[PDB]
Amino acid sequence: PPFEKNFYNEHEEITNLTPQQLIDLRHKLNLRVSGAAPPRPGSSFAHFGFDEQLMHQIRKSEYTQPTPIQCQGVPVALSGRDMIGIAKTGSGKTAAFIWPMLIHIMDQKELEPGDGPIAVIVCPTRELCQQIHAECKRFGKAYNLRSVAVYGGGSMWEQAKALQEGAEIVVCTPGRLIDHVKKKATNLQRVSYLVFDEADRMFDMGFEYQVRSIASHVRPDRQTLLFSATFRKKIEKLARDILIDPIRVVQGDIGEDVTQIVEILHSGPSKWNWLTRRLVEFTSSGSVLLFVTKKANAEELANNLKQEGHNLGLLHGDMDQSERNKVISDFKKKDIPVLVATDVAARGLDIPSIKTVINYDVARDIDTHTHRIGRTGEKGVAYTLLTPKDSNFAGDLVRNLEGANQHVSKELLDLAMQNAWFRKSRF
């Protein structure tokens, strides 16, 4: 069944901000925001456009004015966008995802007998479950919404009974939710708003498989919000897998991006002319690192560059250690300005003098892409060469660039938009 996600009407005070004022507002809120077309933050409850019933509960809070994560997160969530909130306890983040949840639920048909929850909030612990549940019942009273908490360490049978009475909101720990679903105490068929809170803690406590299973069994066009106190590769990979074009919202003191240039060329063989026209200018800025995936391709490129007159090294995975150390040392001491390497062989290349990284052959995946361009220096740039056969990777690259507030050319976007799974799921 269809449902709405976007309930947001931007306040004129926010629409009227100049670009500089917007930049300074996010600085004032100590927020770093990225992603495609993020909504502007607000600074007051009036900017959120909450009705009198919700404001009544908010005024009996415990809140004024909104917290920074609320200022930016509420417009993201009200706009129907997915979100990664990198923020700590208890920065008001729970209300940041609860208030829009209530609005989202209020738009839908009421629960019929047999209906599962409309919103699910997944938590690492019984303790957090109970706190979040308490907040859901407090604010949810504005609209007489029902919340049930199901967590490990709690009565399986009382939880089953509460789920059977019906609830718009289920707050849970992952394994216990999955258990009740398999037992048909509840079901996920009406879930359209899905929150993973303290996702880093959930991974640390062993729940990644359960988190992924829940995401896999909820409709893919859901709205999904993910919160973590830290960003680590595991959670970033998770976000790529279970979110669609999220807005990334980072509280400033908890965070602390490489310049990417993407060119779309005619075909694989035309990469050679591209490179020979540019390689001397690149070496004039510093050392140049070219990546390929396959040993054979590394070899062919390096041999062609040698015949071209370039002073370069080659690094592939079948090199012994001494062989390997010579090339890397030569590159470090700037004896050779150019190095061709495969991904598997590239350990040891965190070299400050690298001012150009070139993804000559496309990375296997976006994780590998990120690892590659991390070798770049600032003054340093990472070029990526695509051809029209790279449209799937292009979609992943667009999303990577957007999360890094890097330029997405029209050409690159058009290439990514060739595929329906991108072109639709696209926010």
Partner 1 sequence: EMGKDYIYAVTPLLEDALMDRDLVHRQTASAVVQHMSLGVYGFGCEDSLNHLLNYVWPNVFETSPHVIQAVMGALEGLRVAIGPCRMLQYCLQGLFHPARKVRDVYWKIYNSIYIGSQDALIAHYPRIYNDDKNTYIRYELDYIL
| Site of interaction with partner 1 (CB under 8 A) | 204, 206, 230, 232-233, 256, 350, 374
Residue 90 counted as an annotated binding residue: yes
User: Sheet harboring 147-150: ordered strands across?
Assistant: 31-34, 247-251, 83-86, 223-228, 193-196, 119-122, 169-172, 147-150
Residue 374 counted as an annotated binding residue: no
Supply the Cα-derived Rg of the chain in whole angstroms. Answer: 25
Residue 89 counted as an annotated binding residue: yes
Closer by beta carbon to partner 1, 57 or else 406: 406
Residue 342 counted as an annotated binding residue: no
Closer by beta carbon to partner 1, 148 or else 401: 401
Angle at 287 between CA 281 and CA 288, to 5 degrees: 70
CA–CA dist 139, 64 (Å, integer):
15
Q: How far is the CB of 230 from partner 1 (least distance, A)?
A: 5
Residue 96 counted as an annotated binding residue: no
- Collect all residues with Cβ–Cβ distance below 8 Å to 178 and sequence separation of at least 6: 210, 213, 214
Angle at 25 between CA 22 and CA 29, to 5 degrees: 145
Write down how long the chain is.
Answer: 427
Q: How far is the CB of 260 from partner 1 (least distance, A)?
A: 16
Q: How far is the CB of 370 from partner 1 (least distance, A)?
A: 9
Residue 91 counted as an annotated binding residue: yes
Q: How far is the CB of 93 from partner 1 (least distance, A)?
A: 18
Closer by beta carbon to partner 1, 343 or else 361: 343
Question: Residue 296 class from Cβ within 10 Å (0-12 exposed, 13-18 middle, 19+ buried)?
Answer: exposed
Q: How far is the CB of 323 from partner 1 (least distance, A)?
A: 20
Closer by beta carbon to partner 1, 9 or else 230: 230
- Collect all residues with Cβ–Cβ distance below 8 Å to 423 and sequence separation of at least 6: 417
Q: Are 93 and 69 in contact (CB under 8 A)?
A: yes
Three-state DSSP class for residue 173: coil
- Collect all residues with Cβ–Cβ distance below 8 Å to 336 and sequence separation of at least 6: 311, 312, 313, 327, 330
Residue 87 counted as an annotated binding residue: yes
Q: How far is the CB of 253 from partner 1 (least distance, A)?
A: 9
Residues forming the annotated binding site? 87-94
Residues forming the annotated binding site for ATP? 87-94
